[PDB]
Each structure stands twice: as C-alpha cells, then as structure tokens.
RNA sequence: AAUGGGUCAGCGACUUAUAUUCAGUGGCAAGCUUAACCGUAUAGGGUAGGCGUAGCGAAAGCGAGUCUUAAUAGGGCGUU
RNA sequence: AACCCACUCCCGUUGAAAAGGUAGGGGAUGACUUGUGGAUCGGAGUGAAAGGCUAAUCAAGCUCGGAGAUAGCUGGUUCUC
RNA sequence: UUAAAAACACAGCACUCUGCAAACACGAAAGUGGACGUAUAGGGUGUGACGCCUGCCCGGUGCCGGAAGGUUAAUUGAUGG
RNA sequence: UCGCUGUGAAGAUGCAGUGUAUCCGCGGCUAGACGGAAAGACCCCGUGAACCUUUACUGUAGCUUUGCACUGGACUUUGA
RNA sequence: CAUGCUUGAGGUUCUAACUCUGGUCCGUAAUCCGGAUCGAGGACAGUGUAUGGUGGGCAGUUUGACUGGGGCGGUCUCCUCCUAAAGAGUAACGGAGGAGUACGAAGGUGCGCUCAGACCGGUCGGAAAUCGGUCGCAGAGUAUAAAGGCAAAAGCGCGCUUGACUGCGAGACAGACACGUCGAGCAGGUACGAAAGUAGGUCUUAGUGAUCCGGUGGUUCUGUAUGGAAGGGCCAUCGCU
C-alpha cells in the first residue's frame, strides 16, 4: 500500500440561507472560485468569500446573461 | 534559495523592513520607497544584512 | 498542570514583564479614609497611628473615593486631581 | 505545610481584576514570512479561556 | 468447564497534620480578625500581620479611569 | 580388595533418604585419598572453566538499616431507605 | 542435586613483554607476592603427543619505528573596543 | 452428583426434549469431572529489573604530556 | 657591530637539596626503623596541584509508536479528488496524485487585445516554423498536483510605479486549547487615472515548527547608599529534516 494520505476538511458552503437576516460583515458563502457571484450589498474576499456590506435579507437569485447565480441583500 | 535581507530607511531612524531575494539572479541592491512610522513620511530604504 | 504529555500552557506561552521593586514601599489611600486620623493632620506617621498603612510604607497617594469627612491638612502626601478638589472643597488645606 | 505556587506559571499569567492576563505564542522568531496583519493581531495581552482557568488556578494554588 | 472461598469465632482497608477553594449555618460590619507572647490562665490583653474598601499598565506612573497610538479616533480591561 | 568416584538399568518420587538402594561400573604408588590446625569473600574470593562453588540460598551470599522504596498493574473494600 | 563428553588440562610448539627497586598483581599508602629467583629466568597470549607440512594479501583496525611539515591544552598577555 | 441429541461465554451431572434406573457397600480399571500440584517458563505488554557486549551517550580508576612548587652554582650555543 | 642590563630555548659539567628495596657503626641481644659515615645517582627521578591524550578496566542509563499477535517491510506534518449516504463533519496497512517552493516583477494602477485547432494559397524548412484569408468559440491558457473558477476576462502586451504601506478595526466563519480564515470602515502618508475610482501582494486552496535559550537594531521604562553603567523589561528581527 502506497496510498494513505488526505487533507483536513475546510468547512466550505452556504452559511446563511435565503430569507435570513444579515448584519454587516457577516460571512455568507465560503467558496473555491466563484460558484456564487456577489450581488447588491455583497462583497468578495481575496479567497472568493462572500460577505455582507449592508443589513437585510439574503436573496439568492440567478439572472443576467451567462446564467450566473447571485447573492444579494434586500431590505427586511 | 532566497536569502533574507533588511531594508533600512534613509532617515536617521533605526526603523527597518525585512524580506528575501534571489541573490544569484538579481545581484543589484534593492532600492525601494516605503513608509517610515517614526518620521511619518515615505522615504528611501536600502538593503542590508538580515543576520 | 498535566495534560497527558501534550505541552502544557505554563510552558507553551511566553514569559513577560518584570517585577517592580520600587512599588513595594507604596500605599494608596481613599478620601473616605482621611476622616479617621486623630486630629486634623494627615501625615505619614499619623496614618500609621491608625491602621491605614503598614509600617514599611514610605510613599502615599490619595485617590478620589467616597466623601471627605472634615477639614484636614496633608503633610507631604500626594493626591490626584479629583482628590485635590475634594480635599480642598471641604476646607481641607493642602501644603508641603 | 504552605502550598508552593508553580514558578513558571507565575511568570506567564498575571492576576488582574478582570482575570488572568497572558501573552501570545508564535511571536518569538521566524517573523519575515508572517503577514503584518497576523503579527499585529498577536501583539497585545489577553484573558485566559474559560476552559483553562480551572487548571491554571490550580497550578498557581488559587483554588 | 474463567477467578476466589473447607467451615466457624475473633481481627482486617478512605485516617491525621498543615495550607486552601466552594456550599450550608452563625458573629460583627466599611470594616473584620489576630499570631507568637503576657495572663487574675478556655476570661482579659496583644491589631505586628492578613483580607476588603480601585483600577489600568511590563514598568515609571496616572487614577474613576487607564493602556495602545501621532490621535480627546477606535479598541481592550475597569467604574453607579 | 579396603578407599575415592558416579557410567547403565530397575525400584523409590506423600521416599527408609530435601539426591538414596540392590545388581553390574571407573581409578586403585599417584596430576592419589584422608585427619587436625591455618589463609583468601560479596562487584569480592576461588575456579584442570560447568557461570561452577562461597553453610539444602548464587548472571553477584546472608543479616539488620534507608524502608511503609516504587507499582499508569492484579486482588479486596464491611449498615438501611 | 537431569549433560562425564568430541568439552577442560596436558607434555610439545610459537609470538610477545621484562636488565632487577624487573614486567605484572593485591594494597588511598607503607608494604607484600613474583623471588631470598636473575633472560637456559619470570609474566601474558594462542595451538595442543608424534609424522609430513604450515601457501598469497600490510588495503581496514591494532602494535612498533620516525620525526620534516599541518593542527593542537593549561600558561602568558601585544593590540583594539 | 445418569445416557443421548440439541441449546448456550461457542466441548453440559445440573438448561430443553427424550430414554433409561429399587436403597447401600466391597475388590478392581482409569474414559470424564476442561481431575490435584506450581498467580504459564512459550507469546505479547510495563515509558518494569538484572547481568553481558560494543567504533551507543556521558563519565571514571589506571597509564601518559606539559606549566608551577620542592629546585641550586658555572660554562657554552642561540633569540628578543 | 666587540661591549655591558634582563629574559626565551638547548647541551655539558659540579655538589649542596632530594633519592638508594648499596657497605659498616650505634640505639640493640634486632634483614623493621632511626641517626652517623662511606659509595652511587643528581637538580634528573619522584610527589602535590593545573592541564591535553588514551582508557568497556569500571559505572549510570537510553535504544519510539501504529500494526487483523510481535518481528521484518511500510507509515508518522501539510494540500487536492473519491469513499462520504445532494448542509457541515465522518474510519481502514481503503483507491489515486502533490508539497517542504517561485516572483522587485510573475505585485499595484491606466490604456489596449483575444486562444487551441482545421482548411485553402505562398521562396528554400514541409505532416508541423514565418505570412495572408476563411471557420471556430474556449476543445487554449493559468509559475507549480487536483478540484472549484475565469468577458468588468482571473488569460496576453505596453507606460508609470512600490498598497508586498503604518495604527487599528464593526462584524463574522471555524474551533478542546494553543493556533487558523474573511473583512467594510476610520486616521496618517502614497501610486496610477481627466475623473468616478482601484490598490493592506500573486485566480483560490500546500510551500511549515510552540516555549526556553542566545545574538542584532531602537527605547518616554527599571537600574540594590547616591550619580552613572552592567544586567533586566518593552518594540522590531535572526538561529531548529
Ligand atoms: C513452544 O513450543 C512452547 C514452549 C517450549 S520451550 C521453548 N511449548 C510449550 O509447551
Ligand atoms: Mg489509502
Ligand atoms: Mg492518496
Ligand atoms: Mg478525512
Ligand atoms: Mg480585498
Ligand atoms: Mg512527545
Ligand atoms: Mg497595620
Ligand atoms: Mg516563585
Ligand atoms: Mg513565528
Ligand atoms: Mg518581541
Ligand atoms: Mg462443575
Ligand atoms: Mg484458567
Ligand atoms: Mg467457576
Ligand atoms: Mg485473575
Ligand atoms: Mg484471568
Ligand atoms: Mg479454589
Ligand atoms: Mg462562611
Ligand atoms: Mg456572613
Ligand atoms: Mg476606552
Ligand atoms: Mg571415609
Ligand atoms: Mg566430582
Ligand atoms: Mg550423570
Ligand atoms: Mg550414573
Ligand atoms: Mg539387574
Ligand atoms: Mg570396583
Ligand atoms: Mg554401587
Ligand atoms: Mg587402567
Ligand atoms: Mg577456619
Ligand atoms: Mg573474612
Ligand atoms: Mg554482593
Ligand atoms: Mg553458557
Ligand atoms: Mg565467579
Ligand atoms: Mg549452596
Ligand atoms: Mg545484582
Ligand atoms: Mg548487604
Ligand atoms: Mg511495600
Ligand atoms: Mg525513602
Ligand atoms: Mg472487589
Ligand atoms: Mg446488614
Ligand atoms: Mg568418563
Ligand atoms: Mg570442562
Ligand atoms: Mg615465556
Ligand atoms: Mg583447542
Ligand atoms: Mg586440533
Ligand atoms: Mg597496517
Ligand atoms: Mg602501511
Ligand atoms: Mg607515533
Ligand atoms: Mg452449539
Ligand atoms: Mg452441567
Ligand atoms: Mg453437548
Ligand atoms: Mg453427557
Ligand atoms: Mg440445577
Ligand atoms: Mg436439564
Ligand atoms: Mg432434561
Ligand atoms: Mg489403577
Ligand atoms: Mg479417572
Ligand atoms: Mg485436563
Ligand atoms: Mg503475586
Ligand atoms: Mg499470570
Ligand atoms: Mg507507556
Ligand atoms: Mg548494564
Ligand atoms: Mg591526567
Ligand atoms: Mg607534574
Ligand atoms: Mg619488590
Ligand atoms: Mg633504616
Ligand atoms: Mg639503616
Ligand atoms: Mg658523595
Ligand atoms: Mg626531577
Ligand atoms: Mg614531572
Ligand atoms: Mg603527578
Ligand atoms: Mg563496564
Ligand atoms: Mg556499560
Ligand atoms: Mg564510553
Ligand atoms: Mg544514578
Ligand atoms: Mg536510577
Ligand atoms: Mg537501563
Ligand atoms: Mg531518549
Ligand atoms: Mg508495539
Ligand atoms: Mg487479531
Ligand atoms: Mg488474525
Ligand atoms: Mg501481524
Ligand atoms: Mg519495523
Ligand atoms: Mg447527508
Ligand atoms: Mg457533505
Ligand atoms: Mg471515528
Ligand atoms: Mg509523498
Ligand atoms: Mg497572473
Ligand atoms: Mg496563420
Ligand atoms: Mg470583455
Ligand atoms: Mg459556528
Ligand atoms: Mg493625479
Ligand atoms: Mg531547553
Ligand atoms: Mg551598589
Ligand atoms: Mg545605585
Ligand atoms: Mg541595556
């Protein structure tokens, strides 16, 4: 056997789901690459982390050309 | 391998930065502009010995 | 402090600071304790006539706490700015 | 007889009215490869964790 | 079909000292309490000392504030 | 042959015996056997050498102290709701 | 006190050390054995009557000899800070 | 204080089903009572123990080099 | 450079220290021991102390764990995919691959542009170089494995440059602890751009090692009678297959 290796799990994924109340600075999605793109009121980190710049409600809409998926914040 | 150096400000203050470089490929001394907290201006820094 | 062989906290973190031997001759006194000396003179030896300070104390400072009871005069004892007004307001002369 | 406090515990944890202070690790050497933000945030002093107070106090003979 | 005990009677294993933390129950109370020692000897005296009434800082120091900092900006710890 | 020894078989193995007995066996003027007295010893003695012997105890005697060594290991831990 | 043997000893052989207050051993030391001996003697090591013999390798590790050169301790203390 | 076939800490005098069998000795034989004896010696484990080895680590007796002391006079070569 | 003054080093010699397990006298009736005297050696030997070498002769100890029993073999920290059951997490001596770096530009910014490949024509190259045209839309590329991304291209070129800045930091994610990850905004100074603006390294996830100890640069701290210093503290940094 010449196989026994693996790496620690990074705990990626959606942290806040749709309809939830966000506060500014909260982390929304942890990603490799941009599987979700930043919408209104959402910024992108230097490792493709989606966080919140304003307060409100998570939206999770897909729109526009290229058929992307957008995470935005709307008024509660 | 990259070897550590020090960048010391042109101002008389003893403040310095630290980094590394490729001594084999780039032999000329690094002459960079950086911010000096002690005098609170952007001045010229020059390479020295990390040791 | 044992943890099963893992490096314990008292050896995992750095030591820091030094112990000031200058502060071992120091004492602090509230303004609410000033109305307990015998009569109208708050001095180093008079604070030792009660049990306000130990016999090994040489420097005393007064901070602001509580209220001053009467009009006392301080003989070579320091005070803060809040206690300077409190002592002075109740006729308490300050000198030396 | 009298309890003897651990010598090395008293040099690393200082008692205050807000608990026990201590410094941070990973700040002794190998500091060029670290980020300035990472080194700036390891600079102050902080309070002991709720899970370490019991085992540290017992080393300092405080409980 | 793993251990131990043939049976009876007697003996046979969480104690003590000194330091300390938490709880219950009391005495005093911004104060409480004495140790050696003296003693008309479980009384009375002896308050040297210990804890509390103020914190922040590695420290000098300043103090209801203090530390970091160029910063009465932020932030940590503290205060009715 | 006496004396010293211990090669084989059987018996005995709770033995007559904590190493024997009956039958056979080896040396038997020598590097022999033996009495009495004396010398060497515990990391030490002595050894024609088997790690053998040093009071039925030996890859370090016995005895009294350090000492109730230490035991993350077995065993045990006593009346009632 | 489960092994008596092909094991140990042996006469014979070789190497090596030792010039005497000998090498060597037991003793903090004094001293004692070697030995009231003196290289045809004494200690250590291996082989093991007798017969015929005992071949090649000095690179490794030991021992013996050499002292030019290189490194090298306590000690001393120029010079600088 | 029975046999068998099953079940079951997995090889049953004692459990299930079933078959056999009046109560108790004495002389014999050893198939079972995982029969008695010795807290398995083999194997593994313990941050266990002894004793042995070596170019394991760290020391050390002994042996050996030089400086200083006990320790002096003269001549000669040679250096500063 | 004869010459005088001291010292370093070697050689020879002398006697007077020291040595004699050499002779003869005495204590004494004595192979010990002393003292006296002859003889030999002689500042050597030997002993004390400081120091280098050798030294299993002797001693106190160490010599890992996992493991379909132990040994032998293999592994031990980090990253990517599957196992993993459509939130996170999830084991085996399960199935497959990488890391222990690189870059002063391969970073920042303003401006500009799109690939691989196929076919047709064209001087030697000829299946495949450089050239022109048509088709194509990502089958290319990304410093480096794999996964997830990439048109405001995160891919390629050029000008200017040092934000690969200093003090912080609302709020979160992860989490036994120690560590780890993201970050709008504020204050100082900057770089590109006409400006809105963007910049607290690189498309993201590996490229790493606590404390102690010791060194180097600063310092409004301390500094055992006092004034200094030594030493200590604080801040920045260096030394661990
Ligand atoms: C092995 O066969 C074992 C020990 C034998 S002695 C090495 N058997 C025991 O009966
Ligand atoms: Mg595997
Ligand atoms: Mg693998
Ligand atoms: Mg896993
Ligand atoms: Mg960003
Ligand atoms: Mg460990
Ligand atoms: Mg008092
Ligand atoms: Mg202490
Ligand atoms: Mg570090
Ligand atoms: Mg530091
Ligand atoms: Mg039974
Ligand atoms: Mg059993
Ligand atoms: Mg049983
Ligand atoms: Mg048992
Ligand atoms: Mg058992
Ligand atoms: Mg029994
Ligand atoms: Mg109480
Ligand atoms: Mg009460
Ligand atoms: Mg504040
Ligand atoms: Mg006889
Ligand atoms: Mg015999
Ligand atoms: Mg026999
Ligand atoms: Mg026999
Ligand atoms: Mg017969
Ligand atoms: Mg006979
Ligand atoms: Mg016979
Ligand atoms: Mg015969
Ligand atoms: Mg005798
Ligand atoms: Mg004796
Ligand atoms: Mg012994
Ligand atoms: Mg043997
Ligand atoms: Mg022996
Ligand atoms: Mg015996
Ligand atoms: Mg022993
Ligand atoms: Mg004994
Ligand atoms: Mg015992
Ligand atoms: Mg003891
Ligand atoms: Mg029990
Ligand atoms: Mg009962
Ligand atoms: Mg025989
Ligand atoms: Mg033999
Ligand atoms: Mg000989
Ligand atoms: Mg032989
Ligand atoms: Mg032979
Ligand atoms: Mg040779
Ligand atoms: Mg040679
Ligand atoms: Mg030689
Ligand atoms: Mg069955
Ligand atoms: Mg049964
Ligand atoms: Mg059965
Ligand atoms: Mg049956
Ligand atoms: Mg039954
Ligand atoms: Mg039954
Ligand atoms: Mg039945
Ligand atoms: Mg029978
Ligand atoms: Mg039977
Ligand atoms: Mg049996
Ligand atoms: Mg036992
Ligand atoms: Mg057992
Ligand atoms: Mg263990
Ligand atoms: Mg040993
Ligand atoms: Mg020596
Ligand atoms: Mg000498
Ligand atoms: Mg002699
Ligand atoms: Mg004599
Ligand atoms: Mg004489
Ligand atoms: Mg003479
Ligand atoms: Mg001499
Ligand atoms: Mg000498
Ligand atoms: Mg000597
Ligand atoms: Mg030894
Ligand atoms: Mg040894
Ligand atoms: Mg050794
Ligand atoms: Mg020891
Ligand atoms: Mg020991
Ligand atoms: Mg050992
Ligand atoms: Mg070890
Ligand atoms: Mg193991
Ligand atoms: Mg198994
Ligand atoms: Mg198996
Ligand atoms: Mg196995
Ligand atoms: Mg192995
Ligand atoms: Mg699921
Ligand atoms: Mg999942
Ligand atoms: Mg599990
Ligand atoms: Mg690998
Ligand atoms: Mg790039
Ligand atoms: Mg073309
Ligand atoms: Mg575009
Ligand atoms: Mg969480
Ligand atoms: Mg401009
Ligand atoms: Mg250490
Ligand atoms: Mg002084
Ligand atoms: Mg002083
Ligand atoms: Mg200093």
């Amino acid at each position: 056997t010449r196989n026994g290796r693996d790496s620690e799990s990074k705990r990626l994924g959606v942290k806040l789901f749709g309809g939830q109340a966000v506060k500014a600075g909260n982390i929304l999605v942890r990603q490799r690459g941009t599987k979700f793109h930043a919408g209104y009121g959402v910024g992108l980190g230097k490792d493709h982390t989606l966080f919140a710049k304003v307060d409100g409600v998570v939206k999770f809409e897909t729109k526009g050309a290229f058929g992307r998926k957008y995470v935005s914040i709307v008024a509660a | 391998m990259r070897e550590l150096i020090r960048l010391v400000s042109s101002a008389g203050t003893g403040h310095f930065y630290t980094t590394d470089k490729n001594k084999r490929t780039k032999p000329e001394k690094i002459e960079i502009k950086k911010y000096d907290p002690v005098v609170r201006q952007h001045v010229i820094y020059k390479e020295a010995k990390i040791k | 402090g044992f943890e099963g062989g893992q490096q314990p906290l008292h050896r995992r973190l750095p030591k820091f600071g030094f112990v000031s031997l200058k502060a071992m001759d120091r004492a602090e006194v509230r303004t609410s304790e000033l109305a307990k000396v015998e009569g109208d003179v708050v001095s180093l030896q008079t604070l030792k006539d009660a049990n306000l300070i130990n016999q090994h104390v040489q420097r005393v400072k007064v901070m602001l706490s509580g209220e001053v009871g009467r009009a006392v005069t301080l003989k070579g004892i320091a005070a803060t700015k809040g206690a300077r007004a409190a002592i002075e307001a109740a006729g308490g002369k300050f000198e030396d | 007889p009298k309890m003897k406090t651990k010598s090395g515990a008293a040099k690393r944890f200082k008692k205050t009215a807000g608990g026990l202070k201590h410094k941070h690790a990973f700040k002794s050497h190998i500091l060029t490869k670290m980020t300035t933000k990472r080194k700036r945030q390891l600079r102050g002093t902080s309070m002991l964790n709720k899970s370490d107070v019991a085992r540290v106090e017992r080393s300092l003979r405080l409980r």
Side-chain angles (χ1 to χ4, degrees):
Chain A
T1 181
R2 299 294 296 163
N3 260 330
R5 291 165 312 265
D6 206 0
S7 65
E8 299 167 352
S9 277
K10 293 299 173 270
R11 283 84 163 148
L12 311 164
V14 188
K15 308 292 171 200
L16 283 84
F17 287 82
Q20 291 202 20
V22 290
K23 300 289 94 175
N26 276 3
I27 279 180
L28 304 184
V29 185
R30 290 264 210 209
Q31 295 162 135
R32 296 283 165 260
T34 45
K35 185 183 287 185
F36 298 90
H37 285 75
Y40 178 79
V42 179
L44 192 80
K46 74 157 154 153
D47 68 336
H48 311 294
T49 302
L50 296 181
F51 61 90
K53 293 187 286 185
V54 301
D55 299 339
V57 175
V58 186
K59 197 44 176 74
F60 268 121
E61 190 176 54
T62 176
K63 67 184 289 184
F66 313 101
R68 307 166 149 154
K69 288 174 316 213
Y70 281 93
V71 190
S72 48
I73 287 154
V74 290
Chain B
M1 187 147 153
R2 294 173 90 73
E3 54 93 28
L4 298 182
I5 56 164
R6 273 168 57 177
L7 303 148
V8 59
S9 63
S10 69
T13 76
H15 178 254
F16 62 96
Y17 283 83
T18 48
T19 180
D20 46 340
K21 67 184 289 184
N22 200 1
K23 243 182 186 171
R24 175 182 40 92
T25 287
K26 307 302 196 71
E28 59 90 24
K29 300 276 170 291
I30 296 185
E31 191 76 24
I32 203 77
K33 176 158 302 151
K34 296 194 147 301
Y35 175 79
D36 198 319
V38 168
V39 298
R40 294 179 66 189
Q41 315 279 333
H42 268 96
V43 292
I44 295 291
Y45 279 68
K46 300 164 95 180
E47 152 165 5
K49 294 176 182 174
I50 189 79
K51 175 65 75 72
Chain C
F2 194 60
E3 289 179 14
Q6 180 192 2
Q7 202 74 39
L9 287 171
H10 52 102
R11 298 200 36 182
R12 216 198 288 153
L13 306 178
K15 328 188 288 183
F16 73 108
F18 73 111
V19 159
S20 165
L21 312 156
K22 204 178 187 161
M24 293 180 183
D25 70 79
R26 200 169 79 190
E28 70 182 52
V29 163
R30 285 93 169 141
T31 47
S32 57
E33 279 169 1
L34 280 194
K36 294 181 176 67
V37 292
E38 202 173 0
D40 278 323
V41 189
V42 177
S43 315
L44 202 68
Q45 183 62 255
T46 300
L47 287 173
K48 292 168 183 180
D49 283 357
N51 267 287
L52 276 297
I53 60 165
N54 295 24
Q55 322 283 302
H56 78 113
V57 167
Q58 328 281 350
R59 316 185 277 139
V60 160
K61 203 188 180 182
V62 173
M63 63 183 108
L64 180 59
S65 313
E67 265 297 326
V68 167
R70 38 182 162 112
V72 302
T73 76
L74 263 67
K75 182 64 70 177
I77 288 162
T80 73
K81 295 326 289 163
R84 182 65 60 84
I87 294 175
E88 182 65 26
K93 182 62 65 68
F94 189 88
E95 55 85 17
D96 208 1
Chain D
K2 267 184 188 177
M3 294 182 286
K4 293 227 202 188
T5 75
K6 201 177 282 296
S7 308
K11 307 171 154 144
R12 307 179 151 91
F13 311 94
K14 306 312 214 291
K15 180 67 174 66
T16 48
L20 300 153
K21 323 193 286 206
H22 68 91
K23 287 301 183 86
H24 290 302
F26 305 89
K27 203 72 179 319
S28 183
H29 59 100
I30 298 169
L31 294 164
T32 289
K33 68 166 73 148
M34 288 206 215
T35 311
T36 303
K37 156 175 165 169
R38 203 182 152 215
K39 301 187 289 207
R40 176 177 65 235
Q41 294 181 333
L42 282 162
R43 199 187 284 147
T45 188
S46 66
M47 283 317 158
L48 214 49
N49 201 54
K50 65 182 181 180
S51 300
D52 309 319
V53 169
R55 78 149 55 99
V56 162
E57 283 200 300
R58 180 166 167 265
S59 298
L60 292 161
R61 301 313 196 249
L62 287 180
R63 92 176 287 278

